[PDB]
Structure formats: structure tokens, C-alpha cells
Amino acid sequence: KELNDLEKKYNAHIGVYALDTKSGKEVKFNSDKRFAYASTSKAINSAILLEQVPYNKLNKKVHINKDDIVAYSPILEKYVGKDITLKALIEASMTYSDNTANNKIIKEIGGIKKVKQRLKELGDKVTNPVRYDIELQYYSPKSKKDTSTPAAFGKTLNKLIANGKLSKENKKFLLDLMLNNKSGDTLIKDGVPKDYKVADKSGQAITYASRNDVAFVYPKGQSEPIVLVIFTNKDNKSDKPNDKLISETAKSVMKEF
Ligand SMILES: *C(=O)[C@@H](NC(=O)Cc1ccccc1)[C@@H]1N[C@@H](C(=O)O)C(C)(C)S1
Numbered sequence: 254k255e256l257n258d259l260e261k262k263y264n265a266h267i268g269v270y271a272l273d274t275k276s277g278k279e280v281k282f283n284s285d286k287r288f289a290y291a292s293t294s295k296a297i298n299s300a301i302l303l304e305q306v307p308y309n310k311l312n313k314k315v316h317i318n319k320d321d322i323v324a325y326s327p328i329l330e331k332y333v334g335k336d337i338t339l340k341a342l343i344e345a346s347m348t349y350s351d352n353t354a355n356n357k358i359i360k361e362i363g364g365i366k367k368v369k370q371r372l373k374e375l376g377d378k379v380t381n382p383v384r385y386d387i388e389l390q391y392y393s394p395k396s397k398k399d400t401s402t403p404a405a406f407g408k409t410l411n412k413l414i415a416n417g418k419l420s421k422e423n424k425k426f427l428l429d430l431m432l433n434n435k436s437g438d439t440l441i442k443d444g445v446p447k448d449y450k451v452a453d454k455s456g457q458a459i460t461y462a463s464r465n466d467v468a469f470v471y472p473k474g475q476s477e478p479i480v481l482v483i484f485t486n487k488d489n490k491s492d493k494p495n496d497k498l499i500s501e502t503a504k505s506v507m508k509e510f
Contacts, residue, residue, distance in 0.1 A: 268484035270403035275477035288484035289392030291456030308422035311340035329353035352386035379405030440466035444503035462487035464494030
């Protein structure tokens with residue numbers, strides 16, 4: 254309804270899935286439509302690693318070489334020939350959307366093929382990781398590669414983080430990164446009521462103005478999060494997104510709760 258209106262105001266396509274984990278209440282709009290998840294996949298990879306490595310053991314270091322470095326790695330770019338702890342990899346991936354950190358997290362997990370296995374165990378047969386960064390960012394409406402539906406992606410985010418194989422410490426370390434992430438400030442954070450806490454991970458693919466934001470939103474007073482997945486995109490390959498679209502979509506969706 255009003256989301257269709259926002260699709261008209263911004264000449265864009267909105268994908269929404271939101272789940273209040275307390276009530277089990279869901280808001281869906283183009284929720285079974287495929288979108289490039291882009292960097293929002295970093296939250297998923299980070300959480301999967303965290304299921305396998307206890308907080309105390311995030312101090313394990315791993316070697317970084319030139320072959321590991323991919324574009325848009327503001328943190329990892331300085332670790333060629335150096336060691337980095339898994340904790341700092343996760344921090345890089347989440348806070349700076351470091352692409353090299355995210356690939357190394359997927360490697361730690363055991364590779365794309367293992368992320369796929371985990372996804373399927375969580376009943377997610379939609380989220381479709383195929384490539385590492387940055388190649389996963391070359392979205393095409395014609396390919397399913399590195400795409401998901403807001404519903405499949407949110408359900409996974411809910412089963413992985415919102416409840417709940419993560420220890421209290423690993424769950425806190427991930428969510429704090431997401432809460433403290435100043436790079437998602439123009440998205441969901443921008444549209445939610447100022448007293449709501451928002452723990453997000455944003456994404457922007459190279460093509461079709463694919464701009465996304467996923468978050469754990471805590472309406473003031475509630476501790477149970479509302480999982481919010483907003484995927485947007487446009488008709489043209491070189492289209493530039495408008496973050497206000499996501500900000501407005503989040504505002505609208507939050508009234509439903
Ligand atoms: C996650 O979505 C990452 N996206 C890319 O690596 C592709 C890309 C898209 C637009 C500009 C540059 C690179 C990260 N998200 C972007 C972004 O927010 O635009 C980063 C440049 C932070 S990498």
C-alpha cells in the first residue's frame with residue numbers, strides 16, 4: 254500500500270521482510286522476490302563463523318597475503334604479509350564492510366560451499382552465495398547468483414542471530430558492531446523513531462542501484478528485536494540509489510509494530 258507508494262515516489266523496487274521476534278508478527282512486501290544482498294551477507298558470514306569459534310578464541314590469528322586482498326578493504330589492505338585475529342576480521346567486515354575480511358571469514362567457515370551447507374541446515378534454500386567479494390556484487394536481474402528474498406534472508410538472520418546458537422558474548426560482540434556501525438545511518442537508522450536502537454549491516458551492489466539494509470531493531474521498551482530486511486533496486490544498471498527510500502520504508506514498516 255504505502256510501500257507501493259514509495260516504489261512510485263522513488264521509481265524503485267522494494268523488498269521487505271520484518272519479524273517482531275516477541276509476537277512472531279511479520280510485515281512482507283515483495284518478500285519472495287530475489288535481490289542482490291550485496292554486503293548484507295557480511296552479517297550472515299560473521300554470525301556463522303561466531304557459531305563455530307567461541308568468544309575467547311577470537312584471538313586466533315590468521316595470515317593475510319597479497320592474494321587475499323580484494324577491492325574496498327580499508328582495513329585488510331594493511332595486513333598483507335601480516336596476521337590478524339578473527340575478532341579484528343569480523344570487526345573489519347562489520348564496521349568497514351571490508352571485503353577482504355569478509356572473504357577470509359567465509360574461508361574460515363570453510364568456503365562458499367560450507368556457507369551453503371549451513372544455510373540449508375537453517376532451512377534456507379533461497380539465499381544463494383556463489384562468489385566471493387567483490388564479484389558477488391555484480392548483480393544481474395537475470396541471475397540468482399548472490400541473491401536472496403527478503404523473507405529467506407530475514408528468517409536466516411532470525412535463526413542465526415535473533416534465536417540463537419550464538420553465545421551471549423558472541424551475540425553481544427556482533428550486535429554491538431552492528432549497533433555501533435555509523436555507515437548504516439542514512440538507512441533504517443534514519444527512518445526509525447530516534448529512541449529505537451538499530452543494529453544494522455548495509456549493502457550496495459555495483460549494479461541496478463542495489464541498496465540494502467538489514468537490522469535488529471529494538472523499539473524503546475522492547476528487548477526482543479524486530480528483524481528488518483529492506484532490499485531495494487532500480488530498473489537500470491547504472492542507476493544511483495537514494496538512501497531516503499530505505500529510510501522511508503523503515504519508518505513505514507515500523508508503524509506496523
Ligand atoms: C557491500 O555491499 C560492498 N559493496 C561492494 O563491494 C560493491 C560496491 C558498490 C558501490 C561502490 C563501491 C563498491 C560494500 N558496500 C559499499 C558501499 O557502501 O557502497 C562499500 C564501498 C563500502 S564496499
